[PDB]
Design a protein around this ligand. Structure first.
Ligand SMILES: O=C(O)c1cccc(-c2ccncc2)c1
Ligand SMILES: O=C(O)c1cccc(-c2ccncc2)c1
Ligand SMILES: [Cl-]
Lengths: 242, 242
């Protein structure tokens, strides 16, 4: 079941923003959120779509392994980190859109659609440009649906090879220490309203795993750092991390 | 290719200790150490042997995956974390000797011997008790030999399944942030003189990989923390980590 905790809103109001945090206790099979309605509100996935995109590219051979180099095309873009060669790890670390756009082109409209249906991903609607539908197309997904999708990935239950799912889980590595491990992916939807920021993944503990998925209104890029900051303060309140 | 940098000794002396640090730049294929002799002096692997031990156990089916639970045998031991159920992740995280002793028993002398030779691991001598040879048996490995093994693990070139190697590298995960990822294994040898502590692994960067292997005199358990502190103080000096 699910369960609402309005107290987390204090973290959002503390930063003069508003959004939703959704946690899932794998052991107890229980979910927690500050806003059950927005937890089920479907938004554009934006760069969080790089998870299923990576899975499909790997399983089809578009990506050989996490070391394959995808050379810069030479176009100077507003994000400096995008103007250099990348591999799967760095491409996901820096949310390099142009690399995954090339993945989607080679994947193809048809194969992308078939796989997202097998993943049961959001509304499964890729309408728009094959190389930007997750940014300005018709695909939509809610926070609870992210967790459902993420859970399949953790258990290697998605309909792709185990290898592909392990590699993507490796590429999602964000932070790790003696207390926890975080495998997650950021997102920043700016092309179509509402402008929001994503952060979806999970926290690995010794004896349990806490899946999470959060989105928040992001009218300007200054507040991107709040995606992780607000998430972590909820984790510290729930005593999941020191 | 190899170069000696006696300046690093300052990090050992300010802590009233002695030891060796060995670095290998994968891109440039160059190695650096503070003591060429000790870098090639072979010691007992101790708990660093849990890398090859895990690889063999996985490849033979002794360990099904990183989720298989290994039940505490109900015998109280002086290490609190050992009086607990474990999987490969927590077992390696907490150096749970009893769990790996059962691995070796199930693996068997013959298969254990055969595999270590394929790995070209240390002196490849499993002489002693199958359930403790890496602690008070005849097997020996030097810091430089550890790196040659670690490098084969990183490139999946060892004579075991790719999956087995990916799993162990996941279990080796120790620390991660926006600047680097560390996958390593600690060691603490006390049954045969000299008493030492190990730390072998590597640092993953965006554009390079730094392999490392260090051991230091450990007369008492009070200085175990210096294994990581000293190693990191060298990494900062070589500007491998901020
Ligand atoms: O957080 C993300 O996922 C993401 C993706 C693409 C671009 C940017 C971005 C845009 C402007 N200034 C800073 C960062 C962020
Ligand atoms: O650091 C390790 O890898 C390790 C492995 C096994 C045991 C111990 C140990 C033994 C006594 N007191 C404290 C710790 C340490
Ligand atoms: Cl990993």
């Amino acid at each position: 079941e699910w369960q609402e905790n309005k107290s987390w809103n204090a973290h959002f109001t503390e930063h003069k923003s508003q959004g939703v945090v959704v946690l899932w206790n794998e052991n107890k099979q229980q979910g927690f959120t500050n806003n059950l309605k927005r937890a089920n509100q479907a938004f554009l996935p934006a760069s969080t779509f790089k998870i299923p995109n990576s899975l499909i590219a790997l399983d089809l051979g578009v990506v050989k392994d996490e070391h394959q180099v995808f050379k810069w095309d030479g176009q100077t873009r507003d994000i400096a980190t995008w103007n250099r060669d990348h591999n799967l790890i760095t491409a996901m670390k820096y949310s390099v859109v142009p690399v995954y756009q090339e993945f989607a082109r080679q994947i193809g409209e048809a194969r992308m659609s078939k796989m997202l249906h097998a993943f049961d991903y959001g509304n499964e609607d890729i309408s728009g440009n094959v190389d930007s539908f997750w940014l300005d197309g018709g695909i939509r997904i809610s926070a609870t649906e992210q967790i459902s999708f993420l859970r399949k990935l953790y258990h290697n239950k998605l309909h792709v090879s185990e290898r592909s799912q392990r590699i993507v889980k490796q590429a999602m590595l964000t932070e790790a220490n003696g207390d926890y491990i975080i495998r997650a992916k950021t997102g920043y939807s700016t092309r179509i309203e509402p402008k929001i920021g994503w952060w979806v993944g999970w926290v690995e503990l010794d004896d349990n795993v806490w899946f999470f998925a959060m989105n928040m209104d992001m009218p300007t890029s200054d507040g991107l750092g709040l995606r992780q900051a607000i998430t972590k303060e909820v984790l510290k309140q729930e005593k999941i991390i020191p």
